[PDB]
């Protein structure tokens, strides 16, 4: 066992001066005053850095030059390992690989690869986030509340594999309530996204079991006075968690401020990043389109914003500098809040006895100095 | 006289077993019924709720008339008829809208307002000019006549900052509306002196992720007052709920009355309570104290307290008006 | 099956006009528009009443002329049945019988009686609330973090009987952290109360597992500028739930307003009532003192406030009339919020498909018109 | 000149790659560095944060002097020495406390204040009289001299309502403090015209379940401004956090400087950020815009905007003052 001391410690509930985090057997054993440490335990200095739970990114397509998408070779255990290592360098110790697809064979490959990865790599990539196939794709028969035969067989496959599927994003207006309810009752977080839902359709989705929404404001209707749409609905429904992309490009910061005030402890930082995040990519392929990284910006051939390159630490920095959200609350948006949203808070999201030892430390300038995964230092800077 | 035997809402709290003593057009005291002078006349509320009289800062027409539409409508008679119609729905004070781009007609509205004000204190409070900068000699004229022009609505993207600043320093409430302003344009209008916005969400841009527009700007700017139409038709109730949470004590109930609104203030109060989850105390503040502060008349109106104007309304728990009182006189009895 | 229609329906998340609650086999089967009802189902009119989840009172000593306290004959299954029937008349379908004691034999009797009652009466009195023995009784050795032998054997008994103990109220400064942690890990809600805890001692209690506080402001230190005490600590700790007595007598309404604003969705209405609630008692015995009910007020021989006679419906009425809290939010304080606080929200606290059919209806004047328990009408007025 | 190359906080937002142009003791503009006139002199901030100058509305003494303690201390020299000491910690504006029950000494403080004000615009802003009604000719005198008396602290339970009302209508901020007031007594003081409270929690009753007292009343009254001492010593940080949540934009950082406080405004700012979970933008507002509004000087002070007084301070991310600027002159350079 060892202790981290000599920096500001953020537990998820407060900042601590002159305290220590004891780590043993991959766990946080205690958080205590320095003076309540065991005689001659090894102290490892934080050097005035802020110590945090490791960041948790619940929507991530790609990073470190790779994507968990588009081809059979990319939808691999190696891709997930690469993405984990890149995430660490920006303080992110946990993520949901996000596979956006309508293809049955890729989706089954993604489930198999997630299971193989999980047997070898605990408390890292947590489970799959599937965004597909029930999306209302940029655009806009049934009484959509009737289950079609292919949709029944698909929902059955997803429910049988709930042990490696953390989240399914879907458009509520495109799917029967029974499908949302079956997924939720199997333990899968059902998220509203890529949707043209009215406020009324959104609320029917919530009542059927949706508890999350995927990147608020993006790929959702605009908000009008008479038609609040899915986004207005999220903002008005206090029990719905939601991700937001804090790059300054996808969502104007004033809309992030408004969202934070309305959502309280339900607003989660996400990157929704792609391959260029934490890498040196100039162009790549995503859901069948060429995207250029030129710079700051992921743009298609028409110059349209078409991806994120955000890292979690950059997101934390943007929320504090440009959204007037206090650092403790920002850290919660990157740790505790997403942990609760996906039901992993018994193991992650705070620094407290019994929790997994996944931590990151950073300077007051938002430069990562340490990342710790299962108690092992994996980034020293 | 004294008003007794009901729930008295002062603007800051509800009071039981209290009384409102009224004398010479003013509230003299709010006290326990025990402290009441002997032989003072008591007028029972009969279990009704008593409120400051409602103040509607965005009103085009009511009682079958508009201060607008033709030419002869801009008159003292029109303002008198609108006052009387407003009283039936608990509303004691309002700002009539004059929509025009004619300098001469504005000059006429100003002298009519002035004449009304001498004849009829504490009723229609001043002009709401909506026009013409919607999406030079005029500015100084308005400035000169600030004492009878309460509110000017303009689109900030259509005017130089100095026009806004000149209006605001003369004492006029400058309100953003009928505007396609971006967030950046809205924020430039606010820095120039805009303190209000006219019927949030309506005649403004939609809110998108990348472009919050004026509506998003107003939501994000703590110090900007704004009206909202609470008929369930102009604004979905969920958007009202969202706006109340972000605006706090800056959200004001308005009717925008004349495809047109037919809302009255007492209807808006009921709709806010029944469909927006806002407590009755706070809804009453949205119809009284908040608009009063927005337009700078809080010293004489917007609460039931010693020395303020005796403008009151009473209503049953089902939101039916039982009394309206103006300068201490009962003008509606139901 | 039958449907309740023709009144305003409060689900826990919204009010509904022109809708229906379908009840079958003791459960809510659906909440739907009137027009989405089955052809010729029996409709039972609400007659313009407001329909709510039944109220849930997590701190209750006695009501209907009886108390679950003080003597071996009173700590009985019959007492619990009586209290259930009295609670129904004021819209309360669920409670935690609250036994305040330091006596080992009464406490074991209370556990046995709670188990016997529960086998015969589902979804009614939910489990025991024990307030004892680790109380700092009005007044004020160890390093209180060392476990004494009798306290170990007691904590072991409570943990073995967690299946019928819902909550234990204790003073954090009087008990070891290990005891709080063992109770919490056995599933028992540990609540801070009857305590002289400083802010520092309160927070150590929270970190060890306390997630509730018993009747905020009452039998806790006052709040000073330099010493916030247990109450200040509760108000500052967002994840701590707490009960508050809304009779206008125990807590000034301005302090209830301040608490609601600081606690958000964590503030729960409780009665903390005694025998006179819902009865015609003039005097009675409670924790060894004579109390007089004279009227409005439960007073001892010295005229000191010494009990509550509040019912849940009176509490709801007081919060709306005197605290400026909107009716929907008040109803949540009496239903959803206490259900979550004690972990019964999968079965109770809202009107939604699959939930237990425990409901009450009341006029806009706060007069109970219906109470429904396990789908059966038990109060018609 | 222009201030460039740092984070500029206007009071409403933080700006990057902007400049603050200063001319004739005033802020002329806040603009993008691209829009800067050619050959204007630039003074680098060197990555510091630039803020309106801090405004301390509760200050007894600093720089080794009090406007108090003996007799000769009530002088223009004293106010000048306190100004200079305040500038070193980023504070450009303050209200000195005069604690006395001597009419003659108050009369002296008033003429000294008046003389200071002619010699030294936009610095010590006016008097804070604390006394004598702490727990007739005097009232009218104070009223007459409202133009140099900014703030009077009294205990509301010790004065008739009419005394409070007379002070407030003359223009003085009437503040409850050094009081044992119950909630009911506090609320009667507010209705009479009290709009402020002096150092929340300190020299007030404790809060009990049944008796919230003055502190509980202030927390529950949305429209009452109040100061709070953020040294970690006078008020536990948890109580500050609780008070910020309930008071919103009405909570002001004060030092109460002279068992005594040694807090400076820049120390308070750091302590609020580091120990109270309040964002830096909002803390800066607690030290600038909020006190400015409380005492009615928001038209000239409390934000960085066109036409306002050029009173500014800059500090490193570690809260060390690098510049202080008063009427456009750099009075501290570190």
CA–CA distance, A276 with A291 (Å, rounded to integer): 10
* Catalytic site positions of B: 256
Q: Which residues of B are annotated as a binding site for substrate?
A: 202-203, 210, 231-234, 259-260
- The enclosing domain of D109 has a CATH number of 3.20.20.140
Q: Across the strands, what pairs with A284? A: A291
Of A15, A324, A365, the CB nearest to D279: A324
Work out how many domains chain B is built from and give that number. 2
3-state secondary structure labels for all residues of chain B: CEEECCEEECCCCEECCEEEEEECCEEEEEEEHHHCCCCCCEEECCCCEEEECEEEEEECEECCEECCCCCCCCCHHHHHHHHHHHHCCCEEEEEEEECCCCHHHHHHHHHHHHHHHHHCCCCECCEEEECCCCCCHHHHHHHHCCCCEEEEEECHHHCCHHHHHHHHHHCCEEEECCCCCCHHHHHHHHHHCCCEECCCCCCCCCECCCCCHHHHHHHHCCCCEEEEECCCCCCCHHHHHHHHHHHHHHEEEECCECCCECCCHHHHHHHHHHHHCCCHHHHHHHHCHHHHHHCCCCCCCCCCCCCCECCEEEECCCCCEEEEEECCEEEEEC
- A290 — contact with chain B (CB < 8 Å)? no
- B279 — contact with chain D (CB < 8 Å)? no
Q: Given an 8 Å threshold on Cβ–Cβ distance, is A15 in contact with D317?
A: no
Q: Are C308 and C243 part of one and the same domain? A: yes
Task: Write out the two tokens for A139.
Answer: 């655009």
Q: Are A25 and A62 part of one and the same domain? A: no
Q: Given an 8 Å threshold on Cβ–Cβ distance, is B217 in contact with A254?
A: yes
- The active-site residue out of A151, A272, A328, A365 is A272
Q: Are B271 and B303 part of one and the same domain? A: no
CA–CA distance, D94 with C41 (Å, rounded to integer): 74
Q: Which residue has the tokens 């007595």?
A: C245
**Is A249 annotated in some ligand binding site?**
yes
Q: Are B157 and B226 part of one and the same domain? A: yes
- B69 — contact with chain C (CB < 8 Å)? no
Of D221, D249, D306, the CB nearest to B222: D249
CA–CA distance, C77 with C75 (Å, rounded to integer): 7
Question: With DSSP H G I counted as helix, E B as strand and the rest as coil, what are the percentages for chain D, rounded to 5?
Answer: 35, 25, 40
CA–CA distance, D168 with C75 (Å, rounded to integer): 61
| Alpha helices per DSSP H over chain C | 77-88, 104-120, 149-160, 177-185, 199-208, 229-236, 253-263, 312-323, 327-333, 336-341
Task: Write out the two tokens for B211.
Answer: 């472009």
Question: C133: cis peptide before it, omega within 30°?
Answer: yes
Task: Write out the two tokens for D106.
Answer: 């108050």
Breaks (C-N over 2.5 A) in chain B follow: 135, 258
Taking CA–CA distances from D199, the nearest residue in chain C reads: C225
3-state secondary structure of D61: strand
Q: Are B227 and B209 part of one and the same domain? A: yes
- The enclosing domain of D306 has a CATH number of 2.30.40.10
Nearest to A214 by CA among A330, A332, A59, A339: A59
User: Which run of H or of E encompasses C305?
Assistant: strand C305-307
Round the CA-based radius of gyration of chain C to a whole number and report it.
20
Q: Which residue has the tokens 């309930």?
A: D246
Instruction: Report angle CA B76, B82, B86 to the nearest 5 degrees.
Output: 145
CA–CA distance, A32 with D182 (Å, rounded to integer): 41
Cβ burial of B34 (10 Å; 0-12, 13-18, 19+) is: exposed
Q: Are D13 and D159 part of one and the same domain? A: no
Of B191, B222, B249, the CB nearest to D222: B249
Q: Across the strands, what pairs with C266? A: none
- C236 — contact with chain D (CB < 8 Å)? yes
Task: Write out the two tokens for C83.
Answer: 């209290």
* Catalytic site positions of D: 256
Name every chain C residue with its beta carbon within 8 A of the beta carbon of A265.
238
Q: Given an 8 Å threshold on Cβ–Cβ distance, is C326 in contact with B277?
A: yes
CA–CA distance, A167 with A342 (Å, rounded to integer): 8
CA–CA distance, C114 with C106 (Å, rounded to integer): 12
| Alpha helices per DSSP H over D223-327 | 237-247, 265-276, 280-287, 289-294
Instruction: Report angle CA D71, D72, D75 to the nearest 5 degrees.
Output: 120
Q: Are A92 and A37 part of one and the same domain? A: no
- A127 — contact with chain B (CB < 8 Å)? no
Q: Given an 8 Å threshold on Cβ–Cβ distance, is C252 in contact with D212?
A: yes
Cα distances from D119 to residues C353, D80, D307, in angstroms, run: 76, 10, 21
Q: Are B321 and B218 part of one and the same domain? A: no
Name every chain D residue with its beta carbon within 8 A of the beta carbon of C249.
210
User: Which run of H or of E encompasses C52?
Assistant: strand C50-53
Of D202, D209, D238, the CB nearest to C250: D209
Structural biology method used: X-ray
D150: closest CA of chain B, how far (Å): 20
Q: Which residues of C are annotated as a binding site for substrate?
A: 141-142, 218-219, 226, 247-250, 305-307
Taking CA–CA distances from C256, the nearest residue in chain D reads: D209
User: Which run of H or of E encompasses D104?
Assistant: helix D103-119
Name every chain C residue with its beta carbon within 8 A of the beta carbon of B248.
none
User: Which run of H or of E encompasses D149?
Assistant: strand D149-154
Q: Across the strands, what pairs with A27? A: A24, A356
C interface test, pick of B8, B279, B315, B317 with most C CB neighbours within 10 Å = B279
Q: Which residues of B are annotated as a binding site?
A: 130, 178, 199, 202-203, 210, 231-234, 259-260
3-state secondary structure labels for all residues of chain A: CEEEECCEEECCCCEECCEEEEEECCEEEEEEEHHHCCCCCEEEECCCCEEEECEEEEEECEECCEECCCCCCCCCHHHHHHHHHHHHCCCEEEEEEEEECCCHHHHHHHHHHHHHHHHHCCCCECCEEEECCCCCCCCCCCCCCCCCHHHHHHHHHHHHCCCCEEEEEECHHHCCHHHHHHHHHCCCEEEECCCCCCHHHHHHHHHHCCCEECCCCCCCCCECCCCCHHHHHHHHCCCCEEEEECCCCCCCHHHHHHHHHHHHHHEEEECCECCCCCCCCCEEEECCEEEEECCCCEECCCCCEEEECCCHHHHHHHHHHHHCCCHHHHHHHCCHHHHHHCCCCCCCCCCCCCCECCEEEECCCCCEEEEEECCEEEEEC
Q: Given an 8 Å threshold on Cβ–Cβ distance, is D317 in contact with A364?
A: yes
CA–CA distance, D323 with D80 (Å, rounded to integer): 19
CA–CA distance, C144 with C147 (Å, rounded to integer): 8
Taking CA–CA distances from C322, the nearest residue in chain B reads: B14
**C23 contacts C4 by C-beta, under 8 angstroms:** yes
**B38 contacts B313 by C-beta, under 8 angstroms:** no
D65: closest CA of chain B, how far (Å): 38
Q: Given an 8 Å threshold on Cβ–Cβ distance, is C13 in contact with A239?
A: yes
Q: Are A49 and A66 part of one and the same domain? A: no
Q: Which pairing describes strands A8-10 and A15-16: parallel, antiparallel, or unpaired? A: antiparallel
Output the furthest CA–CA distance in chain C (Å, rounded). 72
Q: Given an 8 Å threshold on Cβ–Cβ distance, is A326 in contact with D14?
A: no
**C135 contacts C171 by C-beta, under 8 angstroms:** yes
Q: Are A308 and A176 part of one and the same domain? A: yes
Chains that touch A (3 or more CB pairs under 8 A): B, C, D
C250: closest CA of chain D, how far (Å): 6
Chains that touch B (3 or more CB pairs under 8 A): A, C, D
- D212 — contact with chain C (CB < 8 Å)? yes
Query: Could you give phi then psi for residue A224, rounded to 5 degrees?
Result: -110, 170
**C244 contacts C268 by C-beta, under 8 angstroms:** yes
Q: Which residues of C, range 342-371, sit inside 8 Å of A by Cβ?
A: 352
Q: Which residue has the tokens 């009802």?
A: C37
Q: Are D44 and D58 part of one and the same domain? A: no
Q: Which residues of C, range 168-207, sit inside 8 Å of D by Cβ?
A: 199
**D53 contacts D92 by C-beta, under 8 angstroms:** yes
- The active-site residue out of C18, C272, C300, C365 is C272
Q: Which domain holds residue A7?
A: 1-54+344-381
Instruction: Report angle CA A98, A105, A77 to the nearest 5 degrees.
Output: 50
Please report the resolution in angstroms.
2.0
Name every chain B residue with its beta carbon within 8 A of the beta carbon of A240.
none
Taking CA–CA distances from D11, the nearest residue in chain B reads: B191
Of D201, D216, D245, the CB nearest to C255: D216
C326: closest CA of chain B, how far (Å): 4
- A141 — contact with chain B (CB < 8 Å)? no
User: Which run of H or of E encompasses C293?
Assistant: strand C289-293
Name every chain B residue with its beta carbon within 8 A of the beta carbon of D300.
none
Q: Are A244 and A301 part of one and the same domain? A: yes
């Amino acid at each position: 066992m060892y202790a981290l001391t000599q920096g500001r410690i953020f537990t998820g509930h407060e900042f601590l001066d002159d305290h220590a985090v004891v780590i043993a057997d991959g766990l946080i054993k205690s958080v205590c005053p320095v003076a309540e440490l065991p005689p001659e335990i090894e102290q490892r200095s934080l050097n005035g850095a802020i110590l945090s739970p490791g960041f948790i990114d619940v929507q991530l397509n790609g990073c470190g030059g790779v994507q968990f998408n588009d081809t059979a070779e990319a939808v691999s255990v190696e891709t997930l390992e690469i993405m984990q290592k890149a995430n660490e360098k920006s303080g992110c110790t946990n993520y949901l690989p996000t596979l956006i697809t309508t293809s049955d064979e890729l989706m089954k490959q993604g489930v198999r690869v997630m299971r193989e990865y999980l047997a070898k790599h605990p408390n890292q990539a947590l489970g799959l986030h599937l965004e597909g196939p029930w999306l209302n794709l940029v655009k806009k028969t049934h009484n959509p509340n009737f289950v079609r035969k292919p949709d029944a067989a698909l929902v059955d496959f997803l429910c049988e594999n709930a042990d490696v599927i953390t989240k399914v994003t879907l458009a509520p207006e495109m799917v029967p309530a029974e499908v949302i309810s079956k997924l939720a009752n199997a333990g899968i977080v059902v998220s509203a996204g890529h949707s043209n839902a009215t406020l009324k359709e959104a609320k029917a989705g919530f009542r059927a079991g949706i508890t999350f929404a995927t990147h608020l404001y993006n790929a959702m209707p605009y908000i009008t006075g008479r038609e609040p749409g899915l986004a207005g609905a999220i903002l008005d429904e206090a029990d719905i968690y939601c991700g937001i992309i804090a790059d300054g490009l996808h969502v104007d910061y004033a809309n992030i401020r408004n969202a934070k005030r309305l959502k309280g402890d339900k607003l989660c930082l996400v990157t929704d990043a792609t391959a260029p995040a934490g890498a040196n990519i100039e162009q790549f392929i995503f859901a069948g389109k060429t995207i250029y990284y030129r710079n700051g910006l992921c743009v298609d051939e028409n110059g349209t914003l078409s991806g994120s390159s955000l890292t979690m630490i950059e997101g934390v920095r943007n929320l504090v500098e440009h959204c007037g959200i206090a650092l403790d609350e920002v850290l919660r948006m990157a740790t505790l809040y997403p942990a609760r949203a996906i039901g992993v808070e018994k193991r992650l999201g705070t620094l407290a006895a019994g929790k997994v030892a996944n931590l990151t430390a950073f300077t007051p300038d938002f430069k990562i100095t340490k990342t710790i995964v299962n108690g092992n230092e994996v980034v020293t800077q």
